[PDB]
Design a protein around this ligand. Structure first.
Ligand SMILES: *[C@@H]1O[C@H](CO)[C@@H](O[C@@H]2O[C@H](CO)[C@@H](O)[C@H](O)[C@H]2NC(C)=O)[C@H](O)[C@H]1NC(C)=O
Ligand SMILES: *[C@@H]1O[C@H](CO)[C@@H](O[C@@H]2O[C@H](CO)[C@@H](O)[C@H](O)[C@H]2NC(C)=O)[C@H](O)[C@H]1NC(C)=O
Ligand SMILES: *[C@@H]1O[C@H](CO)[C@@H](O[C@@H]2O[C@H](CO)[C@@H](O)[C@H](O)[C@H]2NC(C)=O)[C@H](O)[C@H]1NC(C)=O
Ligand SMILES: *[C@@H]1O[C@H](CO)[C@@H](O[C@@H]2O[C@H](CO)[C@@H](O)[C@H](O)[C@H]2NC(C)=O)[C@H](O)[C@H]1NC(C)=O
Ligand SMILES: *[C@@H]1O[C@H](CO)[C@@H](O)[C@H](O)[C@H]1NC(C)=O
Ligand SMILES: *[C@@H]1O[C@H](CO)[C@@H](O)[C@H](O)[C@H]1NC(C)=O
Ligand SMILES: *[C@@H]1O[C@H](CO)[C@@H](O)[C@H](O)[C@H]1NC(C)=O
Ligand SMILES: *[C@@H]1O[C@H](CO)[C@@H](O)[C@H](O)[C@H]1NC(C)=O
Ligand SMILES: *[C@@H]1O[C@H](CO)[C@@H](O)[C@H](O)[C@H]1NC(C)=O
Ligand SMILES: *[C@@H]1O[C@H](CO)[C@@H](O)[C@H](O)[C@H]1NC(C)=O
Lengths: 237, 232, 299
């Protein structure tokens, strides 16, 4: 109920629809396992790290078979087939090639580490803001009006389950900015004026719940000659 | 034939890349210009091998007229099969249709390809941005919802990666002593490599600790699991 | 070169990764909504004038005047062109740097999304935010008159709505004047769009340096392979060719590393832009100095 009040919906909406909300939440939780298992490409981000590491290591190992312009790629054969003074010049090429390969590997690893650090910082911020509290930032903790998040651990990563609120089944209505009565203009306190064709009510924005227009949920603060589109009706006391 | 105005004492012409592009014929004093003959790149578009074996060929950045059909020995049909021109070059082996779908295999400037049952075949089309919509705007009308839905979605985020270590002497010189002595006079590159690898290894653990250690109290759930009808 | 390993496979992999990442960045930034909304035919929104930002049907490419000025201000230079080899072989005696780049194995690929598609996405976003406020960003779009949306936004910053309802004309006039001044402010200053020009300048400079690097000798008798091959026997020729090969490989490595660093920076900028699009356009932000200076109203 507190979380629903946090998104601009009164708590009596929850207290009168508890069972339906619980059933919807249970069904949504149940569908998650099927959604994850059916799609084989869902966990691509976590597999990419392992694939990249394996590929880099395999390339580094395979690089040892290159000659780099020498007679052979084996140190023992070069040492046994030549005198030393002709052997240093052959060994130097292999040394330089292997050093270059190591430099390239280290640079690539550094760049990947920087990217991973950025991702980890984003994940830490999301854990701090979406799990330990309710966030008002749009599209930060899911699609819709954020309600609550749950964390789970995965190989080399984290998985966030976001639970949000989505409106549905909208209807058309006629609306007015203010109500004229006894030469005074009335504005809604929290809500909007609505007309079903014959009568006028006031309702909250995110859920249809008409109420009788009284002086308890309105304030005057002005006259009835400036507002454009004002409609005059009766206000109950 | 070249239109360049060579001076009487000039015999050659060069360019930015220091390559000769203008020459004077030794026998008849005429100026000629040299241009490398046609070249380009080839891309292969295919679905998975578990589905079919048909492929399409994209010649990149080439007008489909004066098609090379060569360095590649294999020859495409170059006729009969559908031939299409895109801003990325020429496409051979795929048919162009009016229908627009969601993009499956990107090709170029707003052109995608897919494998459709139609007899299975490979088709090309223009991707669709989305479904058309038009909200009825009026200056005295409003729309208000009457029901709600509770939605649950997932998000995956990587945190850490593998920590590796490398020994320079064993990788470069193995167990040989002459190679080690020769390498000993090349400076201190390997100390730098070891320092960088150690820094990355420490940073991985720091990332994991920062992500997964927000609270310092180990709470435990009550034995009775009843939370007003919610199933966890 | 065949016996020097597999450095070039790594270079190709890195370049392909960068190329894919660019399209991913564009898609992430410009594809927030999946519905293509269109503005109503009658353009009356309580006195607010949106003609400077809405698309112009008269022109063929359907761009707003501000978008037209922005596109005219920036020079694009490099792009993807079919039959470009034909234009290069035309030989009008003005050998530009682009043909020199092409004849040495350097090519530029076109983006996946064209400018018209991006303009359509922007138009859909504008129509949605004009006709529905912020409701279309969290579910189905619900229509609402524009002055009522402005009253909601004023209530969002702690000001009662009767302030708006009693000063509608003055607020509309101020908004119209502020919108009108934008074109003059953008056109007068020539250094406003420095960030967008820097990318093109950096790419052109890098490509030109890479092409110019081919004239170095790197300690050989000559920088031309044919001259070395014709002036020497083979056994003296490998030792001359090796120096050139090593120098060119080093140049390629340097270029690839610089490109990777620039790609990382561009990715960070694109992530920031996507966050700003999500938070300032599809809703009202309470973060200080995130969506402008002052109390944010709309973007
Ligand atoms: C609009 O709302 C008013 C207020 O409820 C409706 O008026 C009621 O209509 C019912 C059935 O028609 C009557 O039993 C009540 O006595 C009416 N109330 C009053 C105060 O007269 C009206 O019918 C609604 N109109 C539409 C089209 O739904
Ligand atoms: C709001 O939506 C819910 C769910 O779509 C509706 O509840 C359904 O009502 C029908 C009608 O009897 C049942 O057959 C379904 O089993 C209900 N769903 C669940 C999950 O219990 C509810 O009726 C809607 N409210 C209104 C006012 O239309
Ligand atoms: C919470 O959900 C779980 C599974 O969604 C329920 O466990 C099921 O219980 C029924 C009846 O006891 C069994 O037939 C199923 O095989 C169970 N499924 C699993 C996966 O164990 C559990 O009963 C639910 N909680 C409550 C209080 O009903
Ligand atoms: C919205 O603004 C535009 C331009 O700021 C107005 O278009 C001008 O209209 C006047 C009178 O019709 C012309 O003299 C100008 O040449 C127009 N300017 C341009 C750039 O086209 C437009 O009239 C305004 N909207 C309304 C409803 O008045
Ligand atoms: C509201 O009105 C619009 C046009 O007047 C219509 O398209 C829409 O279906 C209506 N909605 C309902 C719930 O009747
Ligand atoms: C009530 O509103 C109508 C429409 O604006 C107006 O013509 C009428 O004069 C108003 N009633 C009074 C008593 O002024
Ligand atoms: C070279 O000899 C040829 C005859 O084979 C003649 O046609 C040509 O004019 C001569 N050129 C010069 C420069 O003497
Ligand atoms: C392809 O070449 C022909 C012949 O030169 C030319 O007419 C045509 O315009 C070229 N294609 C394009 C797309 O320019
Ligand atoms: C696609 O639509 C255009 C519309 O003018 C039409 O001319 C063309 O024939 C269509 N494509 C095919 C293959 O018929
Ligand atoms: C907006 O309100 C005016 C009242 O002055 C009315 O004339 C106009 O038709 C309304 N707009 C639409 C689209 O109905």
């Amino acid at each position: 109920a507190y979380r629903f009040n946090g998104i601009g919906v009164t708590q009596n909406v929850l207290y009168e629809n508890q069972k339906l909300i619980a059933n919807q939440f249970n069904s949504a939780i149940g569908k998650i396992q099927d959604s994850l298992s059916s799609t084989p490409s869902a966990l691509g981000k976590l597999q990419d790290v392992v694939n990249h590491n394996a590929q880099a290591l395999n390339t580094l190992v395979k690089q040892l078979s290159s000659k780099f312009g020498a007679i052979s790629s084996v140190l023992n054969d070069i040492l046994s087939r030549l005198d030393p003074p002709e052997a240093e010049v052959q060994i130097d090429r292999l040394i330089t090639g292997r050093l270059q390969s190591l430099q390239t590997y280290v640079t690539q690893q550094l760049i990947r580490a920087a990217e991973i650090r950025a991702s980890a910082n984003l994940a830490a911020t999301k854990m701090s803001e979406c799990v330990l509290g309710q966030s008002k930032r749009v599209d930060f903790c899911g699609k819709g009006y954020h309600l609550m998040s749950f964390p789970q651990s995965a190989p080399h990563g984290v998985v966030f389950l976001h639970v949000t609120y989505v409106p549905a089944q909208e209807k058309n209505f006629t609306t007015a900015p203010a109500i004229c009565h006894d030469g005074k203009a009335h504005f809604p306190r929290e809500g909007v004026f609505v007309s079903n064709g014959t009568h006028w009510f006031v309702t909250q924005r995110n859920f249809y719940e008409p109420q009788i227009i009284t002086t308890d949920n309105t304030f005057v603060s002005g006259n009835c000659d400036v507002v454009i589109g004002i409609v005059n009706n009766t206000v109950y006391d | 034939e070249s239109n360049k105005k060579f001076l009487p004492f000039q015999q050659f012409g060069r360019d930015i890349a220091d390559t000769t592009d203008a020459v004077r014929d030794p026998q008849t004093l005429e100026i000629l210009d040299i241009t490398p003959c046609s070249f380009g790149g080839v891309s292969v578009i295919t679905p998975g091998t578990n589905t079919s074996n048909q492929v399409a060929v994209l010649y990149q950045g080439v007008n489909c007229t004066e098609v090379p059909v060569l360095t590649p020995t294999w020859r495409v049909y170059s006729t009969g099969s559908n031939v299409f021109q895109t801003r990325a070059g020429c496409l051979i082996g795929a048919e162009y249709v009016n229908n627009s779908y969601e993009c499956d295999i990107p090709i170029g400037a707003g052109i995608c390809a897919s494998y459709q049952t139609q007899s299975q075949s490979i088709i090309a089309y223009t991707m669709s941005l989305g479904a058309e919509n038009s909200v009825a705007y009026s200056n005295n009308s409003i729309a208000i919802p009457t029901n709600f839905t509770i939605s649950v979605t997932t998000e995956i985020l990587p945190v850490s990666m593998t920590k590796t270590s490398v020994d320079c002497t064993m990788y470069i010189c193995g167990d040989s002593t002459e190679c080690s002595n020769l390498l000993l006079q090349y400076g201190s590159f390997c100390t730098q490599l070891k320092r960088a690898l150690t820094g990355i290894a420490v940073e991985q653990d720091k990332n994991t600790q920062e992500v997964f250690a927000q609270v310092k109290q180990i709470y435990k759930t009550p034995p009775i699991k009843y939370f007003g009808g919610f199933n966890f | 070169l065949l016996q020097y390993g597999s450095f070039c496979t790594q270079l190709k992999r890195a370049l392909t990764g960068i190329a894919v990442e660019q399209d991913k960045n564009t898609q992430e930034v410009f594809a927030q909504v999946k519905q293509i909304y269109k503005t109503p035919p009658i353009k009356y929104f309580g006195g607010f004038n949106f003609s400077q930002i809405l698309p112009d049907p008269s022109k063929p490419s359907k761009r707003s005047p501000i978008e037209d000025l922005l596109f005219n201000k920036v020079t694009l230079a490099d792009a993807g062109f079919i039959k470009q080899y034909g234009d290069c072989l035309g030989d009008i005696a003005a050998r530009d740097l682009i043909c020199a780049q092409k004849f040495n194995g350097l090519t530029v690929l076109p983006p996946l999304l064209t400018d018209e598609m991006i303009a359509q996405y922007t138009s859909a976003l504008l129509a949605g935010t004009i006709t529905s406020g912020w409701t279309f960003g969290a579910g189905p779009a619900l229509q609402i008159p524009f002055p009522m949306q402005m009253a909601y936004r004023f209530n969002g910053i702690g000001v009662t709505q009767n302030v708006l309802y009693e000063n509608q004309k003055l607020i509309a006039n101020q908004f119209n004047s502020a919108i009108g001044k934008i074109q003059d402010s953008l056109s007068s200053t020539p250094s406003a769009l420095g960030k967008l020009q820097d990318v093109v300048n950096h790419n052109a400079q890098a490509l030109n340096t890479l092409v110019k690097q081919l004239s170095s000798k790197f300690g050989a008798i000559s920088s031309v392979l044919n001259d070395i091959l014709s002036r020497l026997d083979p056994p003296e020729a490998e030792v001359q060719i090796d120096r050139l090969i090593t120098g060119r490989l080093q140049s390629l490595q340097t270029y690839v590393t610089q490109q990777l660093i620039r790609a990382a920076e561009i990715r960070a900028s694109a992530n920031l832009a996507a966050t700003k699009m999500s938070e300032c356009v599809l809703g009202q932000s309470k973060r200080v100095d995130f969506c402008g200076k002052g109390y944010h109203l709309m973007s």
